[PDB]
């Protein structure tokens, strides 16, 4: 009985680190796209600040 339980537990293990590495890759890609989104947002913000100063002057 213990051997059967251990085999089931180890199969569950292998599959759960399979989803673990898939989720690791997913976090990597979403974190990268977060970086590009933040950079483009701050660039747009500074660009509008500059053109607002130009408009008022």
């Amino acid at each position: 009985e213990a051997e059967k339980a251990a085999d089931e537990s180890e199969r569950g293990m292998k599959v759960i680190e399979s989803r673990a590495q898939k989720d690791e890759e997913k976090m990597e890609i979403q974190e990268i796209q977060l970086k590009e989104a933040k950079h483009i947002a701050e660039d747009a913000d500074r660009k509008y600040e500059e053109v607002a100063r130009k408009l008022v002057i």
Binding site: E50, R53, V56, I57
Partner: protein, 371 residues
């Protein structure tokens, strides 16, 4: 042969070869010593880190600037900086390459003499020359008249030039520069509860000053806006998290250039010194000087400094007068570009200080006709 155009500056050393379009090596001019003891044996750390390498070890080193206000105070550190520049950043042997050094106006003659002596003895350069940082900046702008304002990190000088003839009596030098702005930013950041005391945190505060600070068109109106609104607050991420948000302290730091009384200085602002130097000159050359205000140096890179300066000088100047301020994108590296252009000239080849001439005339030859 090829010539080397160096620019010691204050806090940023930039060097390269004559004829190039941009400097090849740019790195901070700092020297760091390990303030701790070191437990791991066998590694054998060096006893002095020089250049951008010391920036990577800010947490175990203390940083000292060999130049405080234009002048060199520690000479061994400056010799180390020069050796690093010649042997690692450029990887060129200087025994067969003339060097073109730069220095600020109104400096002690001892500094220039010792610079020449070090260059001729320690490195044995075939020839050398020292040029004013403002003439090179005027060269890089493609002009021949008009004043130039080289506000760097150590010193801020305003040299008027008309038709290639400099006016030594109208040169005004001011010591308020980027380092004082960084110190004032340190002082006013404690107002929000952030304490930056260590010399390593000086680099961090400089980074915030470079990234977030800007010059306000009107100080009082921006004071009223920031007090009521909250759209001026931006957040900066420290090297270990815990992001910090700075609001009213954003345009207060560069206001010291226009309000020197903030840091206890008595002198007038940059806009007023410029106007005073303009009126110090003759009356028949004021029009071109008004119409050819040239800005250079790293400190003049704040967003909106040109507009504020133009507004102030137009308020000071007569109403029937035209004012133009020239602020190219490459203000920071303008001096090096001008130096490269000057060293690339064919007529300049007869102005080098030869080694035989130095050996014949002593270190005082530099103050003679061979400038």
């Amino acid at each position: 042969t090829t010539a080397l155009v160096c620019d010691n500056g204050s806090g940023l050393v930039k060097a390269g070869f004559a004829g190039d379009d941009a400097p090849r090596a740019v790195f901070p001019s700092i020297v760091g010593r390990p303030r701790h003891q070191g437990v791991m044996v066998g590694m054998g750390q060096k006893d002095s880190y020089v250049g951008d390498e010391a920036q990577s070890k800010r947490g175990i080193l203390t940083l000292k600037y060999p130049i405080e206000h234009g002048i060199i105070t520690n000479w061994d550190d400056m010799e180390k900086i020069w050796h690093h520049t010649f042997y690692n950043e450029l990887r060129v042997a200087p025994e067969e390459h003339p060097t073109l050094l730069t220095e600020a106006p109104l400096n002690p003659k001892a500094n220039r003499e010792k610079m020449t002596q070090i260059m001729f003895e320690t490195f044995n350069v075939p020839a050398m020359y020292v040029a004013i940082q403002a003439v090179l900046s005027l060269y890089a702008s493609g002009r021949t008249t008009g004043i130039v304002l080289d506000s760097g990190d150590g010193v801020t000088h305003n040299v008027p030039i008309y038709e290639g003839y400099a006016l030594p009596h109208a040169i005004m030098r001011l010591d308020l520069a980027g380092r004082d702005l960084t110190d004032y930013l340190m002082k006013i950041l404690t107002e929000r509860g952030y304490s930056f005391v260590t010399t390593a945190e000086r680099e961090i505060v400089r980074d915030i000053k470079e990234k977030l600070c800007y010059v306000a068109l009107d100080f009082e109106n921006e004071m009223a806006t920031a007090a009521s609104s909250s759209s001026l607050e931006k957040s900066y991420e420290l090297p270990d998290g815990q992001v910090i948000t700075i609001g009213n302290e954003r345009f207060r730091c560069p206001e010291t250039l226009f309000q020197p009384s903030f840091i206890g200085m008595e002198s007038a602002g940059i806009h007023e010194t410029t106007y005073n130097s303009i009126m110090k000159c003759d009356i028949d050359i004021r029009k071109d000087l008004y119409a050819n205000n040239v800005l250079s140096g790293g400190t003049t890179m704040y967003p909106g400094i040109a507009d504020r300066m133009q507004k102030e000088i137009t308020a000071l100047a007569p109403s029937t007068m035209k004012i133009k301020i020239i602020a190219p994108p490459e203000r920071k590296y303008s001096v090096w570009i001008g130096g490269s252009i000057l060293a690339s000239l064919s007529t300049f080849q007869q102005m080098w200080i030869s080694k035989q001439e130095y050996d014949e005339a002593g270190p005082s030859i530099v103050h003679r006709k061979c400038f």
